């Protein structure tokens, strides 16, 4: 549970964040 | 720069954690 | 504009299908 | 296996676009 990740690469946050946040939202309207 | 990202998942991790490396490789491929 | 990208691999297509339907239902959240 | 994707974003094209050519690159490496 919970797995720390970093990376040299705003850009790659970017869309990790997007990633993450979009896959949150689909637990929660999904269930 | 190194921005740190919380991803709890082994799914969720494993994508960001390929897409880093596979971005990474990119560069040396590239330039 | 639509752009066919013929996916080679399940995990790949599925990949880029839960990141296609993901960006589309957060798009509606937005506008 | 090949699948047929059709992708309305010129944006999230050039995702799956560099996630597949980078994915593909790492597995033609190892297998």
């Known amino acids: ?3 720390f990740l970093k990376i040299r690469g705003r850009e790659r946050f970017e869309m990790f ?3 993450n946040e979009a896959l949150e939202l689909k637990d929660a309207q999904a269930g």
Chains 1, 2, 3, 4 share one sequence.
Request: hydrophobic share 35%; aromatic share 34%; charged share 50%.
């Open 1 to 3: 549970e919970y797995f």
């Open 17 to 19: 964040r997007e990633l």
